[PDB]
Amino acid sequence: NXXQPXSX
């Protein structure tokens, strides 16, 4: 998860 690129 995260607003970051595909991850988690």
mmCIF file with all atom_site columns, all heavy atoms in Angstrom:
data_model
loop_
_atom_site.group_PDB
_atom_site.id
_atom_site.type_symbol
_atom_site.label_atom_id
_atom_site.label_alt_id
_atom_site.label_comp_id
_atom_site.label_asym_id
_atom_site.label_entity_id
_atom_site.label_seq_id
_atom_site.pdbx_PDB_ins_code
_atom_site.Cartn_x
_atom_site.Cartn_y
_atom_site.Cartn_z
_atom_site.occupancy
_atom_site.B_iso_or_equiv
_atom_site.pdbx_formal_charge
_atom_site.auth_seq_id
_atom_site.auth_comp_id
_atom_site.auth_asym_id
_atom_site.auth_atom_id
_atom_site.pdbx_PDB_model_num
ATOM 1  N N   . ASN A 1 1 ? 0.856  -1.157 0.000  1.00 0.00 ? 1 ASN A N   1
ATOM 2  C CA  . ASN A 1 1 ? 0.000  0.000  0.000  1.00 0.00 ? 1 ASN A CA  1
ATOM 3  C C   . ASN A 1 1 ? 0.905  1.223  0.000  1.00 0.00 ? 1 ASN A C   1
ATOM 4  O O   . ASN A 1 1 ? 2.111  1.107  0.230  1.00 0.00 ? 1 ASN A O   1
ATOM 5  C CB  . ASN A 1 1 ? -0.890 -0.014 1.250  1.00 0.00 ? 1 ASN A CB  1
ATOM 6  C CG  . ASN A 1 1 ? -2.136 0.853  1.122  1.00 0.00 ? 1 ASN A CG  1
ATOM 7  O OD1 . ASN A 1 1 ? -2.176 1.811  0.350  1.00 0.00 ? 1 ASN A OD1 1
ATOM 8  N ND2 . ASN A 1 1 ? -3.162 0.525  1.890  1.00 0.00 ? 1 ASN A ND2 1
ATOM 9  N N   . UNK A 1 2 ? 0.337  2.381  -0.239 1.00 0.00 ? 2 UNK A N   1
ATOM 10 C CA  . UNK A 1 2 ? 1.076  3.610  -0.267 1.00 0.00 ? 2 UNK A CA  1
ATOM 11 C C   . UNK A 1 2 ? 0.730  4.375  -1.545 1.00 0.00 ? 2 UNK A C   1
ATOM 12 O O   . UNK A 1 2 ? 0.505  3.759  -2.590 1.00 0.00 ? 2 UNK A O   1
ATOM 13 C CB  . UNK A 1 2 ? 0.736  4.417  0.984  1.00 0.00 ? 2 UNK A CB  1
ATOM 14 N N   . UNK A 1 3 ? 0.677  5.702  -1.450 1.00 0.00 ? 3 UNK A N   1
ATOM 15 C CA  . UNK A 1 3 ? 0.434  6.589  -2.601 1.00 0.00 ? 3 UNK A CA  1
ATOM 16 C C   . UNK A 1 3 ? 1.592  6.493  -3.610 1.00 0.00 ? 3 UNK A C   1
ATOM 17 O O   . UNK A 1 3 ? 1.531  7.033  -4.716 1.00 0.00 ? 3 UNK A O   1
ATOM 18 C CB  . UNK A 1 3 ? -0.920 6.255  -3.252 1.00 0.00 ? 3 UNK A CB  1
ATOM 19 N N   . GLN A 1 4 ? 2.660  5.830  -3.191 1.00 0.00 ? 4 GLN A N   1
ATOM 20 C CA  . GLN A 1 4 ? 3.821  5.590  -4.042 1.00 0.00 ? 4 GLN A CA  1
ATOM 21 C C   . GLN A 1 4 ? 3.471  4.607  -5.167 1.00 0.00 ? 4 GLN A C   1
ATOM 22 O O   . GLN A 1 4 ? 2.388  4.020  -5.154 1.00 0.00 ? 4 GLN A O   1
ATOM 23 C CB  . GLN A 1 4 ? 4.967  5.037  -3.185 1.00 0.00 ? 4 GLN A CB  1
ATOM 24 C CG  . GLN A 1 4 ? 4.607  3.761  -2.441 1.00 0.00 ? 4 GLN A CG  1
ATOM 25 C CD  . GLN A 1 4 ? 5.719  3.284  -1.534 1.00 0.00 ? 4 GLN A CD  1
ATOM 26 O OE1 . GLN A 1 4 ? 6.579  2.505  -1.943 1.00 0.00 ? 4 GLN A OE1 1
ATOM 27 N NE2 . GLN A 1 4 ? 5.714  3.752  -0.297 1.00 0.00 ? 4 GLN A NE2 1
ATOM 28 N N   . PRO A 1 5 ? 4.363  4.429  -6.168 1.00 0.00 ? 5 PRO A N   1
ATOM 29 C CA  . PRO A 1 5 ? 4.175  3.428  -7.230 1.00 0.00 ? 5 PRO A CA  1
ATOM 30 C C   . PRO A 1 5 ? 3.915  2.031  -6.667 1.00 0.00 ? 5 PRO A C   1
ATOM 31 O O   . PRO A 1 5 ? 4.299  1.740  -5.531 1.00 0.00 ? 5 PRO A O   1
ATOM 32 C CB  . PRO A 1 5 ? 5.504  3.460  -7.985 1.00 0.00 ? 5 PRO A CB  1
ATOM 33 C CG  . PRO A 1 5 ? 6.026  4.830  -7.759 1.00 0.00 ? 5 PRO A CG  1
ATOM 34 C CD  . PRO A 1 5 ? 5.606  5.202  -6.367 1.00 0.00 ? 5 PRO A CD  1
ATOM 35 N N   . UNK A 1 6 ? 3.270  1.182  -7.485 1.00 0.00 ? 6 UNK A N   1
ATOM 36 C CA  . UNK A 1 6 ? 2.822  -0.167 -7.085 1.00 0.00 ? 6 UNK A CA  1
ATOM 37 C C   . UNK A 1 6 ? 3.775  -0.846 -6.102 1.00 0.00 ? 6 UNK A C   1
ATOM 38 O O   . UNK A 1 6 ? 4.901  -1.195 -6.460 1.00 0.00 ? 6 UNK A O   1
ATOM 39 C CB  . UNK A 1 6 ? 1.386  -0.137 -6.523 1.00 0.00 ? 6 UNK A CB  1
ATOM 40 N N   . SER A 1 7 ? 3.307  -1.036 -4.877 1.00 0.00 ? 7 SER A N   1
ATOM 41 C CA  . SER A 1 7 ? 4.121  -1.559 -3.798 1.00 0.00 ? 7 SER A CA  1
ATOM 42 C C   . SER A 1 7 ? 3.257  -1.688 -2.554 1.00 0.00 ? 7 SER A C   1
ATOM 43 O O   . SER A 1 7 ? 2.908  -0.686 -1.933 1.00 0.00 ? 7 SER A O   1
ATOM 44 C CB  . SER A 1 7 ? 5.298  -0.625 -3.517 1.00 0.00 ? 7 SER A CB  1
ATOM 45 O OG  . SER A 1 7 ? 6.372  -1.314 -2.895 1.00 0.00 ? 7 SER A OG  1
ATOM 46 N N   . UNK A 1 8 ? 2.880  -2.914 -2.226 1.00 0.00 ? 8 UNK A N   1
ATOM 47 C CA  . UNK A 1 8 ? 2.866  -3.059 -0.771 1.00 0.00 ? 8 UNK A CA  1
ATOM 48 C C   . UNK A 1 8 ? 0.450  -2.355 -0.388 1.00 0.00 ? 8 UNK A C   1
ATOM 49 O O   . UNK A 1 8 ? -0.697 -2.579 -0.781 1.00 0.00 ? 8 UNK A O   1
ATOM 50 C CB  . UNK A 1 8 ? 1.471  -3.475 -0.284 1.00 0.00 ? 8 UNK A CB  1
#
